Design a protein around this ligand. Structure first.
Ligand SMILES: *[C@@H]1O[C@H](CO[C@@H]2O[C@@H](C)[C@@H](O)[C@@H](O)[C@@H]2O)[C@@H](O[C@@H]2O[C@H](CO)[C@@H](O[C@H]3O[C@H](CO)[C@@H](O)[C@H](O)[C@@H]3O)[C@H](O)[C@H]2NC(C)=O)[C@H](O)[C@H]1NC(C)=O
Ligand SMILES: *[C@@H]1O[C@H](CO)[C@@H](O)[C@H](O)[C@H]1NC(C)=O
Ligand SMILES: C[N+](C)(C)CCOP(=O)(O)O
Ligand SMILES: [Ca+2]
Ligand SMILES: [Ca+2]
Ligand SMILES: [Ca+2]
Ligand SMILES: [Ca+2]
Lengths: 212, 216, 212
């Protein structure tokens, strides 16, 4: 049984799409495989495309995943942990702006600790990216939702920034923020990536994906 | 195979399928049917039987086409009146209607029960009370009406509602909702012939997104 | 087991979508069925819809197929060969312009040969269609890509018209050309069908599909 989207590609599945893979415990998970980008074989765990799905959600909803296979989704923190748990996988963030310019950022390794240990981002070196590095900042940080104050801020970033992320004090990227659609008067609260288009530009497309 | 598998989108949710998407369920006669589950809205577990999203599919269709279903799992579809009957025949599924306008305003309507009868009763709508909903109630008017299409007029109008309003629905004389009407993209001059919900955006506004869905 | 999209239709699958069929040799293949158009039961091997996928690809990429089940794709020349080898598939070509006007072309028989014959086009008579006939000109020609020029031009048709096709000298259709979005000054390098909207109009939607 295929472990990853990479295995599916090696088995001759050349079209991107939803396929079932088997996580280490042999639980089946239907995941979105990107078989085109950068050699293919990526498992996509976040996708924003059109603002049809609310990403301003609570801890339990980020834990189990939400959205739709027909568009936007977060795969879920438990699933992302299970996917990235033993061994390691490249993280790749793909971004597409309103003018259709591609930026990306690729980290050597990526995982998140299980719910007992919050979803602490354990993340390797930045390898390369036109987006620049905007995650290492958040390394060794719990994930935080509006109703879960694991952030070290005097107040609540998730509420301040209308999303969820490994918030510290507070964020340099915010890809699960509001779908504001370009540049946006308010501060730090869209699909932002600081080193990319900054704290006042919300991307059109966001995808976070993993590969062995 | 049938006896092990899910019988509704609600069972799939309870088994840990948290993403909306197409999954195969087993009807009461054990027929497998691939249906769209909404796991994301109002607690999830809804089986979606109508979906409009971009006007790519013609909804101005005949009786036999509505009977069997048409459209695409990629986008827009009507699941089919025989399937909707089989999904709702045995007890109590509630109905949710989700509508999005071109300005990203989300409105909905929720009904306590919804059942459509078989082909022999012309898919008669059996509709429970309006629970709540920011779209207002534009379906109680249509309670106990036959389903009608352009080529089969079962309405209470002396004419042809399906033709007049370029749709297929449980028309009375004629309508207050028309979610299988034409994809007119927002404001239209033509009367009552779009994806309309009277109490919502009125007879001259065709929604961007329409979804009709059911749950136990 | 279903052998074609037509068998699926006859078994009561009335919604278009991706289903797995069994090729002549019993290899499973997940294919897009069009269950609506012209009686339904078509297996779609090419789809353009929005320009999200690059069709300017090499020989090996066209051989194995590329793109996405959520959108645009080429099914792959080996698969198209395997689908069309055993007998008589009709071909239907569906085109939509930017004013949502539909045109089509239908051919009696269509097959492509194997890799050794360079996926040669074997095309039966034109039956009808509002787009007119812009494929018979290409009868009995090898498929060409940028990196494998099997065309009748002193140069490279695939490069000159940014596509992949059964080019002669050079073309009257170019449905794997660039997604130029309606009328374009540039000559013959879009999703073009000469008898349809001409050498300077690139369709919004193109689909190529087959049925027994
Ligand atoms: C559904 O509507 C029925 C009438 O509509 C028709 O039947 C549909 C299923 C559909 O085929 C439609 O297009 C048809 O036109 C209602 O039936 C009527 O119900 C009436 C009572 O509400 C009944 O009346 C009577 O009232 C008293 C009873 O003591 C008598 O004095 C009188 O003689 C009548 O008997 C009427 O006769 C009946 N009509 C018909 C043609 O059957 C039906 O009740 C309604 N159902 C619900 C749940 O509202
Ligand atoms: C096709 O072209 C070949 C050479 O490429 C030639 O031998 C042949 O006669 C043609 N065949 C048919 C059936 O038209
Ligand atoms: C992936 N690529 C850069 C190495 C080879 C080219 O493939 P294609 O993109 O030309 O079809
Ligand atoms: Ca705090
Ligand atoms: Ca009438
Ligand atoms: Ca070469
Ligand atoms: Ca040449």
């Amino acid at each position: 049984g295929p472990r990853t989207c990479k295995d599916l590609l090696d088995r001759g599945h050349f079209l991107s799409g939803w396929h079932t893979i088997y996580l280490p415990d042999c639980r089946p998970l239907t995941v979105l495989c990107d078989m085109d980008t950068d050699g293919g074989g990526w498992t996509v765990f976040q996708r924003r495309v059109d603002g049809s799905v609310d990403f301003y959600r609570d801890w339990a909803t980020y834990k189990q995943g939400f959205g739709s296979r027909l568009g936007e989704f977060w795969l879920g923190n438990d699933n992302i942990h299970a996917l990235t748990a033993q061994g390691t996988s490249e993280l790749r963030t793909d971004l597409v702006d309103f003018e259709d310019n591609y930026q990306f950022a690729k980290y050597r390794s990526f995982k998140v600790a299980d719910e007992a240990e919050k979803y602490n981002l354990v993340l390797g070196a930045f390898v390369e990216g036109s987006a620049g590095d905007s995650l290492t900042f958040h390394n060794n940080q719990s994930f935080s939702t509006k109703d879960q104050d694991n952030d070290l801020n005097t107040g609540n970033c998730a509420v301040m920034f209308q999303g969820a992320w490994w918030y510290k004090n507070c964020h340099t990227s915010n890809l699960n923020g509001r779908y504001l659609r370009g540049t946006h008067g308010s501060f730090a609260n869209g699909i932002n990536w600081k080193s990319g288009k900054g704290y006042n530009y919300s991307y059109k497309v966001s995808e976070m994906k993993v590969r062995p």
